[PDB]
Amino acid sequence: QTSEYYQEAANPIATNPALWAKVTAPQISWGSTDIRYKKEEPAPIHSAQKSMNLTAWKGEKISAQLVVWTPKVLNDLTFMVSDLTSGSATISKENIRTGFVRYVITDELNKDGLGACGYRNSADFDSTLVADVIDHITPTLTLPANSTQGGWISVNIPQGTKAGKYTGTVTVKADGITLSELKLNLQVKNRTLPPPSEWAFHLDLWQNPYAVSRYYNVEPFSKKHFDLMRPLMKLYADAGGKVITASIMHKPWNGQTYDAFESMVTWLKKADGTWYFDYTVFDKWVEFMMDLGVKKQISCYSMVPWRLSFQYFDQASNSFKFLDAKPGEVAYEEFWMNMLQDFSKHLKAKGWFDITHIAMDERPMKDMQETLKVIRKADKDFKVSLAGTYHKELLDDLNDYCITIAEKFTPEEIEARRKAGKVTTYYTCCTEPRPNTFTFSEPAEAEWLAWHSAKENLDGYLRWALNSWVKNPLQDSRFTAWAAGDTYMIYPGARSSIRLERLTEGIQFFEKVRILKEEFEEKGNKGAIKNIDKTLKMFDESSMDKISPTTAVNKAKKVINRY
Amino acid sequence: QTSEYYQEAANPIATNPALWAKVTAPQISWGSTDIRYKKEEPAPIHSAQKSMNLTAWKGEKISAQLVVWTPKVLNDLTFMVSDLTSGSATISKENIRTGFVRYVITDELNKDGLGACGYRNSADFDSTLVADVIDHITPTLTLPANSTQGGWISVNIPQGTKAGKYTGTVTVKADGITLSELKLNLQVKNRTLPPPSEWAFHLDLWQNPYAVSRYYNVEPFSKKHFDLMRPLMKLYADAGGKVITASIMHKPWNGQTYDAFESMVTWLKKADGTWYFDYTVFDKWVEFMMDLGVKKQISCYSMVPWRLSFQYFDQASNSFKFLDAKPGEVAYEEFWMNMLQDFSKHLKAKGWFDITHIAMDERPMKDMQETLKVIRKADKDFKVSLAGTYHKELLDDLNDYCITIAEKFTPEEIEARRKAGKVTTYYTCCTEPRPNTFTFSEPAEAEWLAWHSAKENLDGYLRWALNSWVKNPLQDSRFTAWAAGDTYMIYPGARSSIRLERLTEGIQFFEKVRILKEEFEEKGNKGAIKNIDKTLKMFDESSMDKISPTTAVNKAKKVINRY
Known part of the structure; x- marks a missing residue:
């Protein structure tokens, strides 16, 4: 305290x-x-x-x-x-x-x-x-x-x-x-709202455990580290958090955040041509997040870092080395098949295979297809995820598809993905001036994000940084890139933000809209379904000049609460 | 065209x-x-x-x-x-x-x-x-x-x-x-600004005629060469350029630029123990630049190339040979005294002796003193220059002293040098990430350099390469050494750069400041002098993280133009 x-x-x-x-x-x-x-x-x-x-x-x-x-x-x-x-x-x-x-x-x-x-x-x-x-x-x-x-x-x-x-x-x-x-x-x-564990809303806010170990200066994955992380990560679980972030290699995002993500897997290339892979960190982290209630999905990053330089521990020289290799190269395929085939066996022994996704990223299309070929060569049942732009050729291959707020799936495409048990969401990032969760963004904008998911008939919402804290996150939210606040939404001491609280309000109202529409569907009340739908139309990314995010959110909450 | x-x-x-x-x-x-x-x-x-x-x-x-x-x-x-x-x-x-x-x-x-x-x-x-x-x-x-x-x-x-x-x-x-x-x-x-020929600002941007002859594939010092150089060098003259670069021996910088400098002087060692020196190229080049309006100073490079290997034309063998000799050696003294005493007589015949500087460079102190001893033994009135670091031992020996941006002369040192009619400036090079004139540097940094001269009470600014073009300078400014743009700031076709244009605006404002301060001193307007000096304090190489170079330049230009 x-x-x-x-x-x-x-x-x-x-x-x-x-x-x-x-x-x-x-x-x-x-x-x-x-x-x-x-x-x-x-x-x-x-x-x-x-x-x-x-x-x-x-x-x-x-x-x-x-x-x-x-x-x-x-x-x-x-x-x-x-x-x-x-x-x-x-x-x-x-x-x-x-x-x-x-x-x-x-x-x-x-x-x-x-x-x-x-x-x-x-x-x-x-x-x-x-x-x-x-x-x-x-x-x-x-x-x-x-x-x-x-x-x-x-x-x-x-x-x-x-x-x-x-x-x-x-x-x-x-x-x-x-x-x-x-x-x-x-x-x-x-009327009764389910507890957070029962919310449909697919919330994915990527977690950075390394920010917490650095800020408190404790050894990573120690009991102290986990003790500090427990109530902190609980903020995300209590908001409907569905996805666990896993770094399965060294610096999936090239250290773009203040705290780089290290590998949760040991990749040891032994001097006899064999490999030892150890998942002790990964397993401790996953089990921890699952004990907190975040257990729908694990996303693993990254086969496709921007610099395409892949660390391993080289036993022969007793040092870290880097493989420079790209999607579409034989060396890349061999390096990643070797690991992913081991990883597949490990996940299956843990009983986590069905929920584990290997995450793609938005890259030139030939490179994305090359990466997907490696994944399926490694294991044909690996699930795959992507947060990026609309690519018609990848729709069937992506079990989790998160699209830019700028682009839309058609109703039929959404429906086919829902019937198939896939996940479909959208994201904002440094691109959008609004709606967003910068530290200067209007509070209502954060609630608006969840309502927008409902208008678009999407499952959820994703953002790239739950807690990738800058140096002094309580004092100063600016960073050497992007608008302030882009890198975190929760604070040291397991302290929430106005942003997360308002987002969580919108998520709750998304659940209320699901519940009410379910009821009106069973009760056959067509007049109410038209009125809920009309209300949701305010949540359009081009309506924001005519109806401010605050005005939209307030009108919509009042309409829903009458039912 | x-x-x-x-x-x-x-x-x-x-x-x-x-x-x-x-x-x-x-x-x-x-x-x-x-x-x-x-x-x-x-x-x-x-x-x-x-x-x-x-x-x-x-x-x-x-x-x-x-x-x-x-x-x-x-x-x-x-x-x-x-x-x-x-x-x-x-x-x-x-x-x-x-x-x-x-x-x-x-x-x-x-x-x-x-x-x-x-x-x-x-x-x-x-x-x-x-x-x-x-x-x-x-x-x-x-x-x-x-x-x-x-x-x-x-x-x-x-x-x-x-x-x-x-x-x-x-x-x-x-x-x-x-x-x-x-x-x-x-x-x-x-208010009237004088034309460039009347600016006080001592701008020295080292010229490379050999880049131009190579790029256009024409004979060095031909009419076509000079015709190509005319509007190109005129960019430098119109910026306030004061100094003519002369290469008085073979490869003063050991061909560190894409185009090496040849000797503008014929050093002929005749077979009767006598020497003949011919200055025809030196003289054509100097007259050409003088005609353009660059006439304050000639700097002659170099007594002190890194390799310390001096070409001469040996008559007896009808071939080029080299003397390997170092400052502090008798052979070095004998070889350089012999040329410098002839050169002295020639420069006096031309009427250029008072403006001609023998350029030293940053070497161990004992080597620099030995080089200076040879120069003064050849002619006690030879002027000498240096671009390097602060050496209290050399302050009265150096008629032109250009110091790194990081180091400062005392006000008392600057004043004495000024009153003695000596020149005192600074430079940037590959060392400084900012302010600079790399092709990726912010445009205002270039202007900032001239304001910095005014802040520091210095005479102007020096940089080592006006036009040492890489292979394809209009397309690709990168080189096998240093950041891109380090080797030139003007382009084929006598085309300027954003960097040269911005620097030249800064130089003009330096002159406006000179002019305003002379007038306010005459009128007694001590409040306006102090206001200008307060404004100039923005141009501190240490405060760039508090006041961006762009912000400093913009606020300063407005303050000066209100007068």
Whole structure:
């Protein structure tokens, strides 16, 4: 707890005392989970809102944000929430989680506003502090004069909760005494959301265990490392996480993240022409993630790193060597068949073969086909995955196909993949200015991603970096490439973000849309299916100028919750 | 003209169609002289900018870059500029030169990002096309589908121009028809910039006549050779060039460039123990450059080639021989005294002795002192130069002292050298990742170099290769040593570069600063001197990560032009 306490970076923007002149005393108000409140300016809240009305299903996790802003020092600010009660029924406060919404340095899109890819020097972009970290650890914070602070509240509504109107009190305190109370009303609906383990939504946020061992300076795959990773990775499992990331060779992504991915497999070329392969790391990591509930799929990276230089341990010289070899070459085929055939046997002995995918990447088409030929030569039943662009010739060969937000599968193609038991999703990355999960992206954008999956009749959503932390991820989210926040969505101390929380809200609403449509399909209610479908039409990547992501998300959540 | 047309190399980077999928028509905008637009990506411009506002002095040369990008073939792309009119007055379009900003192959820094020195095999380094050639010869270009083309515009404002606001039209055409009209506004201020022959800035960019004779396959120092050199060397003269490179012996740099330097002096050792020296080539070359306006200084290379092996024509055997001799040896002294005493008499007969420098180079201190002893024994008034590191022992011996960017003379040292009429400058080379004039360097870095001279109170700037062309310099700027572009900054056809144009703007601003400070000293305006010096402090080689070279240059140009 205490060794996770931390200080934010200095604000790049000076506090203008003139902006604070109207603020006569500390103010405490409900705000919005759509808003990242600036630290150095008063909250844009015309006058304090004392009551919050929420609506939800049994089983659902729902958020609210309160905001505190003060013209004077407030020592040891805290807040807490009572039990919520409703006649004889009560939602216990143990189901309620609180956090300070803390500030990380962020930058901006590329200067043209049209994307966020490319190498960056920090001097070439703006820098500001933005509210994003959900700090559920630090019990109190002392606010200086002329500052604002958000507070996040998560209600994890139990499955067994009786339907009705619950009420509770949020108490906000500083230097020992109660500054304000806020009222919280929750209309719990007579419908039930399954727990995260039962969500259909295929969420894949690639995990970097090496970032955690580096940041805490512990030996990789030690008990300490796993202990630190447990609640952290649990954030992804609790969001519906379906896929385990596995690095089966040295640097699948050429060390593009602050922490490179090392191999979870020993590749030992013995001096007698034989090979020893050992999966002890891989197996420990997989079993760990599976114990956490992430067990749908394992994705293995990469046969196709950008530099096409493949490490092995060379016994004869007792050193690491590199094989330079490319898809379409005999040396590449021989090197990878040798490993994959061993790996196949290993997976089959572990009983993980049916779920293990060898991951392709977006490359010139002749090279992608050459890689797939090697995979099937190694084992004809290896499953294969790709996150990239639409390629009609690969549709049948890819068990997991994640497409750029820019391109669409046809209804029939989606249907054939669903009937075949395959997985079909989309991704955003540094390309899209919006919707996205940069640290400056509007909070609602992250929820919009899940709704968009529902509009497109896709299974899920993928993004390339759950936790590939930069050097000081709590303080500063910028990196030497891409817009800030592109490399992680969760923080040290197993701390969530506004981004992951809003994404997880959208995922929940995606499950609600599946549930409701199932019901209306069995009940034959055609009018409701048309109305849900019409609502989903707002989630189009070209509608965002006409209907903002925030407006879309809010309209859609209200429509769904009436049913 | 037509003998100077050429084709670029093929782009090593395949075009990515997803980048172009929202480009629905050819687009024409003003862009920035800070940017090398990539050929295979759409211009990073949110909304076409139809107007450009420039400010300049009477006498100044000022640039703008426009950019065209297209999702379809455009045949015979072309552009031209109208006269610039201000009510009754006119800047004739005769003073305006245009060019296509054409693409040359380049590489990158050393893999560690810390420097760019050492031998290279091009297969070990990345390859890309970068915009850098100012092609003012080729009248039209056809652009393929999904491509981008920059256009450079240089406005040479006459001395006589009346102060006021001038307006003109840039007309872009292709396929026959007119694609766009762009507006160009130009505030001519009531200050005069002298022509280049009057600039104080000591620019030294070492010339290689032998590259030109090789590339055009013509005899060295023939009329055709000189005719080819004239407009090419005039680029250097129009940038402020002050120094004539002379090779007074065989291979002063041991053929480190693609084209070695031959001796511009015949060293004939006759069979009666006497010598005959003939300076006909030296004299033709020097007179030629003087006629172009390069006449402040002649630098003679080299008493100190790495290999310390000195060619001479031996009459007795009717053959070239070599003397192997080192500084601190009697044979070295006897051989060099003999030539230098003849050379001294010849230079005095020509009236060039006062401007002629014998160039030393960075060697162990004892070797450098022994070389200096020979020079002074030959003639006690010979001037001497050095480009190297700081040596307190040599400060009063060196009439021209150019130091690495990383090291600094004291203010007291600079002042004494200035008051003594000596020259004091700095250089960059393959060492510095920035600021520099590699073909991948940012355009503003080139300008920054001249501002840095002003910040440091130095006389100017030196670089070791004006035009030491590689094999195919219009296509491929890479070499078997150093980062691409290290060996030349001007191109066949007397074509400038973005690097030369930007450096020359920096030199002009150095002169504006000189002029403004002389006037403010006379008027007593101590507040404006201090404001200028505060601005110059941005040009610190240490603060480039806090203030980008591009930001520093841009803020500085605005501050200076408000005066």
